[PDB]
């Protein structure tokens, strides 16, 4: 019957408990011990790029670490030059409903979606001189939550319709499609490798995929709430989650649990954004209390704070060179910190 | 700075200037959000997204419907919500008063006020004529219950009255709650919304001053 | 992509002709345009430059004064009003597209020109005024007076061909980048004040005479051209 087939998925996730206690012998926060804090980060707002008129959802740095592109409600998209404050397109949207923003690595393409259910990719680099929809990519039943470009064809996106694709923009279909959450999946991040990326949802777990065979490889289960961020660890074989438990967590791959807990009482509220810095070592967090929180990865101790935005921090992006973080907030405005 | 600086540096001043007309022609329009689970007539109260424009006193609004405990973060700034309810059915009646609690205490729409249409009341006033169904078989504290056709206006008022303690319980004044009784017939629904946002903007304007 | 330039003709000095340019395939109103001319057996010399949106208007000092620049954005249509003609006027007037924002490829379209026949300064030296070279690899040599390396790491270098009877078109723009459409033969280096553009596998239909612009500063100022002749 069906009791019998609950009854091995239930001895099935305690062999899993127990294969997972088996290898937990030394606490990450117990092997990093005996080594030096990093200290204070003072770390300041060098740049603040006016212009969107609404809240900023979503921005990507692009891959030469000076143009970006920033996704707000008003129904534009904005590349930005960090370096000068110019804009150098304003794209207008179809649906000012927008929730994601993705630059290619090429830098030829731009991509944005939300509750349009409808990815769009523009064309920067044409002649005429205008950003024109490339294609729009239909398919998903939810609002898209995240849109990763893996080249100039393949575009991997995360729905709230508890489902993964990966398109190929030419043809413009589902290549692979990735099920297995109950919940919306609300982030993801791509590995350095673009073999496997992983994904966060309101299921309070964490799966990871592999791409050229549509399966899932790991489950990762500890939030007591919904992930809104996730983000590989730049040696690709760990990541962390932000959950609305006010919790980052750090998890392994090949250890495949958790390794170390980012919390603090004294802040109750939600993580919105999460990225790395170049090492590893820091672990920038934004949060719905208008700042964000810098952690040492290594430590789970506190190492600095990013205070200077007057609306939650629904955003975060650390460049590929490592030299600036980029926040947006609901107040319309990002920034830029060194 | 160079010539190709300069020449770019007049380029984000013309996107400037674009993007701030653009952003006074949308200043100039109020967005609406229509709610309300099924059978309840939220296609037909103004006779992944379906947009309705409509302008009532050369005023313009916006509606949007979907077809939400993760997608109604985005409405945060609407300057109201609008919840349809069927109030001649009974069963769903208690489903439609958990899905307002959790509309109105969502920590998101803490600011945003609802305007309430208590929709098919020609239907609710067959049913309670007729007796077939009686409303103390699904809301015991109705035998208990004495307006402050009488029994159809017992009932409706009734209706309005769980919808308006659940609303009054948690506000704390920072929004509130407009009942209407509609029909599928009305051809006063934009003039109550109308006059639903003068007040709410109102409100608003006088919290940018720290009055109230 | 299309600028089709119209006027031309036969003035008497003293005279005022107005050339109109019509664009076509593209956005005209993000596109800052440019009007350079060519003497009849000369190189290139640049007249008025209109941004986009006429904000700016930069004139050679030649022409300052009794030459006029103006853009029809709706029409499509770029105007040079022409008062108080010389016996110096007399040239090609082609017109150009350029759009300016980072990554940008200015200098990309230029138009079929018209003849008018009318009866401080970077100085751009491209000494090596005709080569003979198929098949081979040959290099064109660039020097600039001042350094054309800004602070900001742009080093604003540009190199265009000019095929017999056909309107110049842009290889290399700021000396190390292909435009859109040119073959990877080509490749430009160098440093400040002194620069090269190297072709490998030189080949037919890819000869003609070589020029080198500097945009760092206005004027721009071009070479006096290199022909590459079989």
């Known amino acids: 019957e069906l009791d019998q087939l609950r009854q091995e998925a239930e001895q099935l996730k305690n062999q899993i408990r127990d294969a997972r206690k088996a290898c937990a012998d030394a606490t990450l926060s117990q092997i990093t011990n005996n080594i030096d804090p990093v200290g204070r980060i003072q770390m300041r707002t060098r740049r603040t790029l006016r212009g969107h008129l609404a809240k900023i959802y979503a921005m990507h740095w692009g891959t030469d670490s000076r143009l970006l592109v920033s996704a707000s409600q008003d129904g534009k998209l904005i590349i930005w030059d960090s370096y000068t404050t110019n804009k150098v397109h304003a794209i207008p949207l179809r649906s000012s409903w927008v929730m994601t923003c993705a630059y290619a690595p090429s830098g030829n393409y731009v991509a944005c979606g939300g509750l349009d259910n409808i990815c769009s990719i523009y064309n920067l680099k044409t002649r005429e001189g205008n950003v024109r929809v490339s294609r729009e990519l239909a398919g998903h039943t939810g609002y898209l939550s995240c849109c990763r470009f893996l080249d100039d064809n393949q575009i991997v996106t995360s729905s709230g319709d508890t489902t993964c694709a990966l398109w190929d923009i030419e043809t413009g279909q589902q290549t692979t499609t990735f099920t297995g959450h109950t919940g919306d999946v609300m982030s993801l991040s791509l590995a350095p490798d673009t073999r496997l990326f992983v994904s966060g949802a309101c299921d309070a777990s964490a799966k990871l995929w592999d791409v050229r065979e549509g399966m899932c490889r790991q489950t990762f289960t500890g939030h007591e709430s919904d992930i809104n961020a996730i983000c590989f660890f730049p040696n690709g074989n760990a990541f962390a989650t932000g959950s609305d438990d006010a919790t980052c967590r750090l998890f392994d791959l090949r250890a495949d649990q958790e390794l170390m807990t980012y919390s603090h009482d004294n802040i109750i509220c939600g993580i919105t954004s999460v990225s790395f810095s170049k090492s590893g070592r820091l672990l920038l967090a934004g949060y719905d209390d208008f700042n964000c929180n810098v952690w040492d990865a290594l430590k789970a101790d506190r190492a600095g704070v990013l205070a200077g935005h007057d609306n939650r921090v629904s955003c975060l992006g650390v460049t590929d060179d490592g030299m600036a973080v980029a926040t947006g907030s609901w107040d319309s405005f990002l920034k830029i910190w060194n | 700075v160079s010539a190709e600086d300069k020449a770019a540096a007049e380029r984000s001043k013309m996107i400037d200037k674009n993007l701030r007309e653009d952003g006074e022609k949308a200043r100039r329009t109020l967005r609406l959000l229509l709610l309300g689970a099924d059978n309840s007539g939220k296609s037909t109260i103004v006779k992944g997204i379906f947009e309705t424009k409509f302008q009532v006193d050369k005023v313009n609004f916006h509606m949007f419907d979907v077809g939400r405990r993760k997608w109604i973060q985005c409405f945060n700034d609407v300057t109201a919500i609008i919840f349809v309810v069927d109030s001649s059915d009974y069963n769903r009646l208690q489903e439609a008063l958990n899905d307002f609690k959790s509309i109105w205490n969502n920590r998101w729409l803490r600011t945003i006020s609802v305007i309430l249409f208590l929709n098919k009341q020609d239907l609710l006033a067959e049913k309670v004529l007729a007796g077939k169904s009686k409303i103390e078989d699904y809301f015991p504290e109705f035998a208990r219950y004495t307006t402050p056709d009488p029994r159809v206006t017992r009932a409706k008022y009734f209706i309005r009255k769980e919808f308006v303690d659940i609303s009054t319980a948690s506000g704390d004044g920072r929004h509130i709650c407009y009942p209407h009784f509609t029909c599928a017939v009305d051809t006063e629904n934009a003039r109550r919304i109308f006059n639903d946002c003068k007040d709410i903007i109102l409100q608003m304007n006088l919290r940018e001053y720290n009055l109230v | 992509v299309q600028l089709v330039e119209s006027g031309g003709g036969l003035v008497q000095p003293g005279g005022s002709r107005k050339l109109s340019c019509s664009a076509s395939?593209?956005?005209?109103?993000?596109?800052?345009m440019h009007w350079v001319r060519q003497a009849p057996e000369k190189g290139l010399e640049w007249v008025a430059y209109?941004?986009?949106?006429?904000?700016?208007?930069y004139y050679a000092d030649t022409v300052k004064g009794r030459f006029t620049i103006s853009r029809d954005d709706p029409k499509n249509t770029l105007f040079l009003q022409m008062t108080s003609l010389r016996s110096e006027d007399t040239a090609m007037y082609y017109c150009?597209?350029?759009?300016?924002?980072?990554?940008?490829?200015?200098?990309?379209?230029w138009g079929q020109g018209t003849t008018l026949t009318v009866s401080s300064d970077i100085v751009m030296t491209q000494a090596t005024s005709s080569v003979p070279v198929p098949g081979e690899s040959v290099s064109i040599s660039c020097r600039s007076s001042?350094?054309?390396?800004?602070?900001?790491?742009?080093?604003?270098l540009y190199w265009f061909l000019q095929r017999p009877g056909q309107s110049p078109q842009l290889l290399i723009y700021?000396?190390?980048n292909l435009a859109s459409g040119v073959p990877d033969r080509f490749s430009g280096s160098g440093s400040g004040t002194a620069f090269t553009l190297t072709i490998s596998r030189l080949e037919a239909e890819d000869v003609g005479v070589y020029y080198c612009?500097?945009?760092?500063?206005?004027?721009?100022?071009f070479g006096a051209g290199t022909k590459l002749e079989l």
């Open positions: 150009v597209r350029s759009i300016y924002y980072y990554g940008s490829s200015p200098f990309d379209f």
């Open positions: 395939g593209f956005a005209f109103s993000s596109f800052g």
């Open positions: 209109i941004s986009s949106g006429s904000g700016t208007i």
């Open positions: 001042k350094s054309l390396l800004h602070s900001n790491g742009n080093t604003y």
């Open positions: 700021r000396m190390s």
């Open positions: 612009m500097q945009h760092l500063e206005y004027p721009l100022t």
